[PDB]
């Protein structure tokens, strides 16, 4: 898709945005791509994961939710409306988007539009509160009520699809078409007014059901099952692991760049036996004042070598001035960048890019001359 390596290499705007956002990449990008002539595609080929990270930092979006339900007031009441919040109103309610499009660049502005919408009956009906006639609403926004009902019918048009017979409740009630039993009592029908018309309680149920169906259907985009779903997984066989087993041969070859006899071994052993029995004179461990001197010389030379090695071991301070310090640091940085690109093109093993290999070798020779 758009996350592939060639798309990230050709995406000039995304590279430029990541380059503006990052600061330490100035000191690598500035003298290599521009001053030293390295191709930007070659520069970003090694930093494809950084490009992919900056791509996925902004490409992902928050999932749909009932943003008008999260919005509640807190005399003066105040509410907070962020851009991601108002955009959430924009996808979850396209009627508000249609209200935005023909109004905010033509007649009147964003904050007074949102004040009119939040004071209108359309906000209450989209939130799911029961609409009653004594509220003023708003005259500009309340003309969109019929359009919102039209959009509700249109939403029901592509939401309505035949379902499986496992959950086909319409088939469940039409299994007997000529059943004519007792009509159930008033607790089983939707509530009615004094005149017998609907009280609108079923309308908010329809609205929240349609809202959930819209949220689930928004997940379904480009971004025999009855047997499996009625099968009892507990009564089947337990899962058998198919992990591979390894047997290691320890017959490794020996490392490559005077056998004593048992008789003389027993003689040496018996010598040790009698030398242990007769006397173990521990005072014999004391050296004879010359081998001890040689031993101490060897040990102190080893100590001197190790102390000179590990006397000294955030970067450490340098005797250079700071200007020459970052001059040498940026020259070493472009040294390492050119070396990395040369080694990748050298070990790629393709004859079609040997010209690029030769160009990078000439860059390395110029780099040697610059050093």
């Amino acid at each position: 898709d758009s996350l592939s390596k060639e798309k990230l290499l050709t995406n000039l705007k995304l590279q430029q945005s990541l380059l503006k956002g990052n600061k330490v990449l100035m000191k690598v990008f500035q003298e290599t791509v521009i001053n030293a002539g390295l191709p930007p595609s070659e520069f970003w080929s090694t930093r494809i994961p950084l490009l992919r990270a900056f791509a996925l930092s902004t490409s992902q979006k928050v999932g749909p939710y009932n943003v008008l339900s999260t919005i509640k007031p807190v005399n003066k009441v105040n509410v907070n409306l962020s851009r991601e919040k108002i955009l959430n109103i924009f996808e979850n309610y396209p009627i508000v988007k249609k209200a935005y499009t023909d109004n905010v660049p033509k007649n009147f502005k964003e904050p007074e539009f949102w004040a009119r919408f939040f004071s209108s009956k359309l906000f209450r009906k989209l939130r799911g509160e029961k609409i009653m006639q004594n509220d003023r609403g708003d005259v500009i926004i309340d003309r969109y009520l019929t359009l919102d009902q039209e959009f509700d019918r249109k939403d029901d048009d592509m939401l309505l699809h035949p379902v499986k017979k496992i959950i086909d409740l319409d088939g469940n009630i039409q299994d007997d078409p000529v059943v004519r039993g007792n009509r159930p009592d008033f607790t089983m029908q939707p509530g009615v007014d004094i005149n017998g018309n609907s009280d609108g309680t079923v309308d908010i149920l329809k609205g929240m059901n349609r809202l959930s169906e819209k949220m689930i259907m928004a997940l379904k985009n480009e971004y025999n099952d009855e047997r499996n779903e009625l099968k009892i997984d507990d009564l089947n066989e337990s899962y058998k692991t198919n992990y591979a087993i390894i047997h290691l041969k320890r017959n490794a070859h020996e490392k490559t760049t005077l056998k004593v006899s048992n008789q003389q071994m027993l003689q040496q052993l018996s010598l040790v036996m009698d030398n242990l029995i007769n006397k173990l004179d521990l005072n014999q461990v004391v050296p004879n004042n010359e081998v001890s001197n040689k031993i101490n010389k060897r040990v102190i030379t080893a100590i001197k070598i190790n102390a000179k090695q590990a006397k000294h071991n955030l970067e450490v301070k340098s005797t250079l001035p700071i200007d020459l310090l970052e001059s040498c640091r940026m020259l070493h940085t472009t040294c390492c960048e050119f070396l990395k690109h040369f080694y990748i093109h050298f070990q790629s093993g393709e004859q079609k890019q040997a010209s690029t290999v030769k160009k990078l070798y000439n860059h390395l020779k110029d780099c040697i001359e610059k050093l």
């Binding site: 000039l12 430029q16 380059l19 503006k20 100035m26 500035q30 791509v33 521009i34 930007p40």
Partner: peptide, 21 residues
Amino acid sequence: EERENEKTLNDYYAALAKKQA
């Protein structure tokens, strides 16, 4: 400086756009 190196980025983007053009 940030202003001048963003100017260098703008000049390089203009050069690239000329390269496709």
